[PDB]
Amino acid sequence: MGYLHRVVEGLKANAGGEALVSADRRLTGAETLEEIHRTARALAAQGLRPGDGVVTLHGNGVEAVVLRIAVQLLGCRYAGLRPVFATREKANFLAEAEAAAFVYQPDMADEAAELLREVPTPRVLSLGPAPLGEDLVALAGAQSAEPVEFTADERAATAVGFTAKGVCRAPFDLEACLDASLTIFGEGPWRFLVCIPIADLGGEMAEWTLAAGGTVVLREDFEPADILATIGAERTTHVFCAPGWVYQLAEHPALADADLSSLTQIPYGGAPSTPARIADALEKLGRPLLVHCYGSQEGGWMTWLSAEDHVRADRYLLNSVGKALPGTEIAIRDQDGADLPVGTVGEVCVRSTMLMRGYWRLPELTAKTVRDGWLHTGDLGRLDTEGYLYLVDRAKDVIIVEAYNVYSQEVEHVLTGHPDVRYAAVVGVPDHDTTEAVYAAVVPAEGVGEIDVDELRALVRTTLGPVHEPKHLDVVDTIPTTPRGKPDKSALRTRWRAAQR
């Protein structure tokens, strides 16, 4: 058994039905498994052993999934360049990757040249006929479809996902991730719309979709009109979305008429969500679909918020990423690294069998990052007693000054406690080039004449420490608020930013 055992088992399970689907080609589990075996054989022929690095430059086609899996079957290291990266960044990735092969989609030959020019690589192959190297699809066609058993170290990296640096994953932790996927997404066959690069997260999600006996529906990227069409046309059960995408789906005029019956779930994540707009989306979908996932290449799946937990009447949880997965442990830690009680804000630190094997060729930063089995995620948040995780909103609630975290509520509370101040709003605003500064607006109390701004600066300095001191501090008659009754801190930020003459 193992990760690839699991993928193959799901394909065999699904041999009669659809496994890989795109606008251009359609394969069954039988037809998919054959190509994988053939491709693996062909790659083996070219001279590729376990541990040998295989860099790819492709899109989200069927042959790209076949290749990603095949490379991993041999126990080679698949290293997908996402096409969205700049050529400068790809050349770095390729240079550092110690590649033995380079595999590129035919219509990207322009870029393959730029790269192979700068980083000459052996065994160049093309997914179909193309100017450079040989044609891998042709090589595979001419080849035995006899099964290829997985026979490498289950704990040896077979995938690198790029981020300035590359995250190695081994089958051991990939299976751990697949297990969580069944927790979050449910079990059984999934018709899973993947429009994330197969070069990384999309690839993982395709591997998993297949392992569970499912069909992958591939699109090249997210566009709301496609997708709404694709969902109904392919009777998809799941589409994984960035939060941005969820909003675009919800705001789309085509949505009233689109057929979403097939959907059981719209898992989303990858970036901070906007509670207000998620709530809009809940109303328009008019059904419990949204499931918030919190994950990284480094940490695997860490938490998730069920669909029901988006709409319970007794709690509000749109500011939550939900609770730990089975086998996942979460501590919140001070800038030095001892635990904090529930309720307190710190760095979210995780330990599960889903952690990455490490950063590629960066063994020192790997140790700065995973410390004694515990991933230091660099994200800031708080747990609660019911077990829910809440990541601070970095725009409203933190300010980073000289590499120190300043919390806006802490500064507000201190200012407000001055008898001359009845209300404060504190926000970080862009300063010189790439720094942040603490700005503050305070509302005077009843009868207060003139406010001594310097006194309030001293108060913060000699309560919290020097860095928490507001650089700028305006006395205002009021703080604008949002329609949900929270202080409008982006209005304050925009206003202060624009006035920096």
Author numbering: 1 to 163, 170 to 507
Task: Paste lines from the article.
Later, an additional structure of ShABS was also obtained from crystallization of the wild-type enzyme in space group P6322 (Data set #3), which had been cocrystallized with the amide product 10a.
Amide Bond Synthetases (ABSs) actively catalyze both the ATP-dependent adenylation of carboxylic acid substrates and their subsequent amidation using an amine nucleophile, both within the active site of the enzyme, enabling the use of only a small excess of the amine partner. In this report, we describe the activity and specificity of an ABS from Streptoalloteichus hindustanus (ShABS), with a broader, complementary substrate spectrum to that of McbA that includes enantioselective behavior toward an expanded range of acid and amine partners in amidation reactions. The requirement for large excesses of amine in these reactions has prompted investigations into the ATP-dependent amide bond synthetase (ABS) class of enzymes, also members of the larger ANL (acyl-CoA synthetase–non-ribosomal peptide synthase–luciferase) family of adenylase enzymes, as these catalyze both the formation of the adenylate and the amidation reaction within one active site of the enzyme and require only one or low equivalents of the amine as a coupling partner.
